[PDB]
Amino acid sequence: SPFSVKVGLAQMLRGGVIMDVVNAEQARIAEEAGACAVMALERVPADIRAQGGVARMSDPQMIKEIKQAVTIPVMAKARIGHFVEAQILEAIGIDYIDESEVLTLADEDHHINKHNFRIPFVCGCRNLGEALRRIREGAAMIRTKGEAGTGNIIEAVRHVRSVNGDIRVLRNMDDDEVFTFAKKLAAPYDLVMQTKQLGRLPVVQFAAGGVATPADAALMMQLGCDGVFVGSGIFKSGDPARRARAIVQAVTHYSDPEMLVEVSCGLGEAMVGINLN
Amino acid sequence: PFSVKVGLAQMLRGGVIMDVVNAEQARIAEEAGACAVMALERVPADIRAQGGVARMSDPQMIKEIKQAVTIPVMAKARIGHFVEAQILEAIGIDYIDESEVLTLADEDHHINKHNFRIPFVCGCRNLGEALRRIREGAAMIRTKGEAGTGNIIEAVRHVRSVNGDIRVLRNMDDDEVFTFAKKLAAPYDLVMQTKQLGRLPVVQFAAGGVATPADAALMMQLGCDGVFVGSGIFKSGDPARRARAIVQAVTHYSDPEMLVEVSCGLGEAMVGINL
Amino acid sequence: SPFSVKVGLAQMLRGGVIMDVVNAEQARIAEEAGACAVMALERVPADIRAQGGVARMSDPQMIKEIKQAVTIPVMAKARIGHFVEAQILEAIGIDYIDESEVLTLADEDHHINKHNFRIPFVCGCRNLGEALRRIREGAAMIRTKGEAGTGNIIEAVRHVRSVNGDIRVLRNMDDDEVFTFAKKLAAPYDLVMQTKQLGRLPVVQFAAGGVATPADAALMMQLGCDGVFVGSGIFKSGDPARRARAIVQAVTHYSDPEMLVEVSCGLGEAMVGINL
Amino acid sequence: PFSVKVGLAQMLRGGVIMDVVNAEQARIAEEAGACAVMALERVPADIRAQGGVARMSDPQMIKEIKQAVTIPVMAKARIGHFVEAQILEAIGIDYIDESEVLTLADEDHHINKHNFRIPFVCGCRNLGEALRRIREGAAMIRTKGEAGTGNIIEAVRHVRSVNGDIRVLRNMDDDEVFTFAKKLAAPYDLVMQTKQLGRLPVVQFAAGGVATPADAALMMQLGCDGVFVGSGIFKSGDPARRARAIVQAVTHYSDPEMLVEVSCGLGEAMVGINL
Amino acid sequence: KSPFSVKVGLAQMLRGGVIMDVVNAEQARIAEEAGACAVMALERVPADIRAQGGVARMSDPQMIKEIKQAVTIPVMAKARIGHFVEAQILEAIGIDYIDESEVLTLADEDHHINKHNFRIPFVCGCRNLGEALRRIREGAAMIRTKGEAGTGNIIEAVRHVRSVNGDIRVLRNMDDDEVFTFAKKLAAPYDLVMQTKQLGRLPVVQFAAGGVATPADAALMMQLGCDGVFVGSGIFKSGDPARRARAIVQAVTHYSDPEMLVEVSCGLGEAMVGINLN
């Protein structure tokens, strides 16, 4: 199936960090740090949060600048439900579209029918039900999301534990109870059973939301994620190039505290961020 | 395979299924022209009136009914009572009806019906519920109103609902179907199967409060595939004449002249209860 | 340890049916039909429901009559918290005390300290948390309880699925998340980990509450219980003797539908029961 | 002086006090081994069942009971009815029990018990209440559950509460005792007396729902000094055998073998009521 | 014999001490000079985290190394609650204690760090006995009974110390049979509830923390039964940090000597002003 081919392609991103970039300078810094891909958007989430205004797909000119700037995969964000923003991005010839809750929602009731596209999609989730609905709409990769643009890992941790926790519950569930589990998740039964049989999400699952330090990036990996997104934590810090590299190494070496010490040491000022509580 | 069971239930299209509590009532139904009999302990109108815990009938009573007729024999099991369904299947009947008229045995889960060889009937009140039962392995749906009142109102409501949501679904923007499945709390693939087919993927019968021939013909004109009658026949003044009249109404549902002749002088319809 | 020895004694009842008896006649019927034990009490749960009034430990005279009337283990019931009733029962020389919610509660805040006794205790539960609390207090056998005295098996199914489902959740759970799990259960952490490592309850788990028919009894076994209690469903029914044997057979041959048809065939009236 | 009355009540430790309505019941209790009899109009289970205003017994009936026995004779007065207590004291009985089982005569104030020569019993449900009664001049406390139901549950609750608060108080930071007295709404000096003593400053008996020997022994094992039994004996099938059995249980409360022999074949316990 | 009990013994060595939050090598020196039993490295003192907002995390490993190099007394550092990777890093630096601290921004709302997986001992905060005992079952070797953070107001430290200690005294004379229910009500492990009953004290070292601003405050915590105190803001948000640090240390050591308490309090400079929240 072409869906299973898209799911197959994203497997290459395991062990990696995907970095949000707003220009070609940010893209090249991300590639040099060892990012597995770049994510082109208008403004980083912390800026979107602070400034407000309507956040949309980036000008295609800018996306073309980022694409010619690097040889790693280039991803770009479209507003939820804005299938025309997605058609434009596809036609530009990038590698993934992230239908992203950080941009301004364009359709509160429906997401993009992602099966109508040739190129693979990333979607956000906060729980298993949401993940499975995005996958059924045709998302080839999942981003388990915390708080966007605060530098606070708390919600990312909550959502990763929730998704992974329901998968472990599901794994051992009495088959006869799975119909009601599916109902309760409002997720498609066949995808729930597929999740049960595999003992993991049927697609690549990354963490996002508030990853600010190498320690945060490694934590996500130890909680069972395949990789991480970093939106704000790199380009809102005092030394983006160094910090980018440290986070990449943290994800590569997530179970090595000696290395985690080394890459974390003398990194300069992290993004101050915001404590919402 | 599930399609075999679904195919079997097609044979019942155009028929009336008559609840029976003993072999005398069983013979009355077959002679009256029923497409099948349904063995249960007490008719739903008596379960309502009397209370107590309503369970699967004693296997000996089901064996007697099975002897007494050549038409398909169905029996009822309590929702979620998978061992009751094992016993019914072991006896050799033709369908199990996992029925809400009996006393619920599991509030959160129905029977995993795909583990059985013989077909199941399940109840529903809406499309979402139908599709959940079907995914569990029901080969036939009963669209249910009120049990044991002789009042057709909730049957009319639920039949209009199931069918109305199917007509909505047929013409729906494909892109909106994912959310529609979320909202129905139903499996997406069954929603699309229903969409492409343009009708329920399994046989749909009306049930609950069918008391007169007019009621039965009404259900068929609303688009059902047949009707169940529980109380309407054996809580009436003359069961045998009334049963034949309902069978005739279901078979000739669009013939007013016929409906007049069969409804003419039928004796007392069941008492019933307005709520 | 003394506690493990009590747990071993109750383990010998696996595959069995424990029947409530109020006199010596019933106790003989239960033994003939093949019960693993009898449970002596004043009135069967359905009669306690219908009649009301305070329900206590049975007269020790009645218990002795039952004890000498049979050769299978003898159990008797004490009110929750009534540690003196339990003292008396142990002094009569019976085999188990069931600290039972069917009797009138004597202490709302505290159960009996069951560790202070020689003979093993049965306690009821509705969820995993509660089972584990009872086991920590010294219960050697757990009765997962539904509705008492109704012939309706619905709550017993609920509570059996609850307990078993929490145990299954617990098996794959991230170890780091077990501390909070134990807090939420209001359960001792060591017992939660013990449950995790075993993948089952640390003691015998029987179903009780509304088992009216052989189908009911076998359902409990297929959901994974070690055995069943039958309180009203035999002695509030048409033919107690025959229904009792049929239930023993259902438990012994729970996954054999041909046997279940056979023993279910022509049993006379089950208990009327009440729906709610 | 108050210590004389408190000292007198010590003599009752280890005993059972039996409510009686006539001289026949009075003789039954003394022969059965009661440490005292309590004269009242109707046993609490009949007051509950029947209603009406429950007052002090007629002095003639109390005189008859006083004649009929040599053990201490107590009688009940309505809460706050100080003239009832004057009459009882004038008759020459040994204790007055200002009892909540009778119909309350003053909702805001109890009897000033220090104005009487003879000792008073008062009820309580908690330590704070005990200490208030004691300050008013009660020489003995009855820790009370439910009157007239044969259900020990509230007795167990209140006995655990009184004793638990005493065990808490014993080990309490001295500096926190002032606030603890504020919270109990109890006199600070009595709270400290209770603290230093490590137990109630007056005799504490359990009462309310004591129906079987096991119940009586349970109260003693919880730390009481004796038990009252109102309904449990004279609403039972055999009062005389049951009374002796309760006396024996109270005297031999830590002997299971004994409790078996005395509870063995006692006939019907009182009906009672679950609430 | 056991790994945990050895960790508990390490923490015992700190009885009678004052642990001082330090944010750099200078403050760390000030603390050792003044007689601190240990230093606690963190990014900003609690009063600054309160006033400034922002996400607060583990200090840069570099800053911790600079603090560790500047002193010979034990070095503690703080990690966010649930952030087990921060703690791995802190352990790999080779410090002596980790404080899973509620002053830093929470990283995991439902779960604390599994502290038995570490070699070095942990401190955790609590506001009641139930909490303390849960932290201990997770592997905390030392408990900090916490009041308000960064206000210089001792009120909530007093409440929390009285609550924990009060509940410990409640257990002493408690009927053994009622303990199961008490354990349920505390949402604590039964075995630690009984161990607390048998000891008549907390099974691990208990310090006070939160709003300790003056020598009188410090001695008050000791007089209430604490084994020592933490001071964050009180020293380094005051007029004379170095003299105030020594005074507090002296007040903890001589907590039942009013004459000394007078001597050490006399002419101390501006105390931290702080804030009254009620």
Catalytic-residue membership of E1: no
Instruction: Name the CATH superfamily housing domain C1-276.
Output: Aldolase class I (3.20.20.70)
Query: Three-class SS string for C77-89?
Result: EEECCCHHHHHHH
Query: Where are any strands of DSSP class E within D104-202?
Result: 120-124, 140-144
Residue C251 belongs to what H/E stretch?
Answer: helix C240-252
CATH class of E1-278: alpha beta
Distances (CA, A) of B182 to A132, A176, A181, B200: 11, 21, 13, 18
**Would you state the structure tokens that stand for residue B50, as one six-digit string?**
């009397």
Contact D164 E172 (CB under 8 A): no
Contact A169 C169 (CB under 8 A): yes
Q: Is C43 helix (H, G, I), strand (E, B) or coil?
A: coil
Per CB-CB distance under 8 Å, the chain B contacts of A136 are 178, 188
Q: Is B209 helix (H, G, I), strand (E, B) or coil?
A: coil
**Closest approach of chain C CAs to the CA of A126, in angstroms?**
19
Distance from chain centroid for Cα E240:
23
Whether residue B79 contacts residue B110, with contact meaning beta carbons closer than 8 Å, is answered with yes
Nearest in space to B29 (alpha carbons), one of B232, B228, B243 = B243
Query: Three-class SS string for B59-112?
Result: HHHHHHHHHHCCCCEEEEEECCCHHHHHHHHHHCCCEEEEECCCCCCCCCCCCC
Nearest in space to A208 (alpha carbons), one of A229, A227, A223 = A229
Nearest in space to B267 (alpha carbons), one of B234, B236, B240 = B236
Per CB-CB distance under 8 Å, the chain E contacts of A212 are 55, 57
Compute the distance between CA of residue B241 and CA of residue B266 in angstroms, rounded to an integer: 7
What's the length of chain A? 277
Query: Where are any strands of DSSP class E within chain D?
Result: 16-20, 36-39, 73-78, 95-99, 120-124, 140-144, 203-207, 226-229
Fold of A1-277: TIM Barrel (3.20.20)
Where b means 16+ CB within 10 Å and e means fewer, B23-51 reads bebbbbbbebbbbbbbbbbbbbbbbbeee
Compute the distance between CA of residue A124 and CA of residue C147 in angstroms, rounded to an integer: 45
Nearest in space to D26 (alpha carbons), one of D59, D62, D69, D72 = D69
Residue E22 Rama label (left phi>0; alpha psi -120 to 50; beta): beta
Active-site hit among A6, A67, A77, A114: A77
Q: Which residues pair with D219 in a beta bridge?
A: none
What values do phi and psi take at D268, rounded to 5? Answer: -70, 120
Whether residue A30 contacts residue A235, with contact meaning beta carbons closer than 8 Å, is answered with no
Whether E51 has its CB under 8 Å from any CB of chain A: the answer is no
Residue A20 belongs to what H/E stretch?
Answer: strand A17-21
Contacts of residue A123, defined as CB under 8 A and 6 or more positions apart, other chains included, come to A98, A99, A111, A114, A134, A135, A137, A139, A141, A142, A143
Compute the distance between CA of residue B174 and CA of residue E67 in angstroms, rounded to an integer: 63
Compute the distance between CA of residue C103 and CA of residue D274 in angstroms, rounded to an integer: 10
CA angle E107, E113, E114 (to 5 degrees): 160
Nearest in space to E62 (alpha carbons), one of E28, E88, E25, E36 = E25
Compute the distance between CA of residue C82 and CA of residue C105 in angstroms, rounded to an integer: 8
**Minimum CA–CA partner of E185 in chain C:** C186
Whether residue E268 contacts residue E261, with contact meaning beta carbons closer than 8 Å, is answered with no
| Owner of token pair 């299947």 | B89
Contact D256 C52 (CB under 8 A): no
Q: Which residues pair with D19 in a beta bridge?
A: D38
Residue A182 belongs to what H/E stretch?
Answer: helix A178-185
How many C-beta neighbours within 10 Å does residue A59 have?
Answer: 10
DSSP string for residues in C164-202: HHHHHHHHHS-GGGHHHHHHHHT--HHHHHHHHHHTS-S
How many C-beta neighbours within 10 Å does residue A221 have?
Answer: 20
**Would you state the structure tokens that stand for residue B247, as one six-digit string?**
């069978």
Whether E127 has its CB under 8 Å from any CB of chain A: the answer is no
What values do phi and psi take at A122, rounded to 5? Answer: -100, 140
Where b means 16+ CB within 10 Å and e means fewer, B96-125 reads bbbbbbbbbbbeebbbbbeebebbbbbbbb
Contacts of residue E42, defined as CB under 8 A and 6 or more positions apart, other chains included, come to E21, E22, E23, E59, E77, E78, E101, E103, E104, E232
Long-range pairs, C238-243, Cβ under 8 A, ≥24: C238/C267, C238/C268, C238/C269, C238/C270, C239/C267, C239/C268, C240/C26, C240/C29, C241/C29, C241/C32, C241/C33, C242/C267, C242/C268, C243/C267, C243/C268, C243/C270
**Closest approach of chain C CAs to the CA of A157, in angstroms?**
13
Helix axes C154-172, C214-222, angle to 10 degrees: 10
Contact D260 C108 (CB under 8 A): no
Q: Is D182 helix (H, G, I), strand (E, B) or coil?
A: helix
Mutate one of E178, E180, E182, E186 to test the C interface: name it (highest C CB count within 10 A). Answer: E180
D270 DSSP 8-state letter: P
Long-range pairs, D189-192, Cβ under 8 A, ≥24: D190/D131, D190/D134, D190/D135, D191/D131
Confirm or deny that B209 is annotated as ligand binding: yes
What's the length of chain D? 275
Asked if E touches C (at least 3 Cβ pairs < 8 angstroms), the answer reads yes
For D1-275, CATH gives 3.20.20.70
Resolution in Å, one decimal, please.
Answer: 2.2
Start-end of H helices in chain E:
3-12, 25-33, 46-52, 61-69, 84-93, 129-137, 155-172, 179-186, 190-199, 215-223, 233-236, 241-253, 258-265
Confirm or deny that C100 is annotated as ligand binding: no
**Would you state the structure tokens that stand for residue D259, as one six-digit string?**
């409790």
Distances (CA, A) of C19 to A151, C142, C248: 63, 15, 10
Residue D188 belongs to what H/E stretch?
Answer: helix D188-197
**Would you state the structure tokens that stand for residue C262, as one six-digit string?**
């056979």
Whether A151 has its CB under 8 Å from any CB of chain E: the answer is yes
What's the length of chain B? 275
Whether residue D155 contacts residue C81, with contact meaning beta carbons closer than 8 Å, is answered with no
CB-nearest to B188 from A136, A176, A183 is A136
What residues does each domain of chain A span?
1-277
Whether E174 has its CB under 8 Å from any CB of chain C: the answer is no
Q: Which residues pair with B38 in a beta bridge?
A: B19, B74
Contact C172 A168 (CB under 8 A): yes
Whether residue B211 contacts residue B270, with contact meaning beta carbons closer than 8 Å, is answered with yes
Experimental technique, in short, is: X-ray
Whether residue B199 contacts residue B245, with contact meaning beta carbons closer than 8 Å, is answered with no
CB pairs under 8 A between D and E: 25
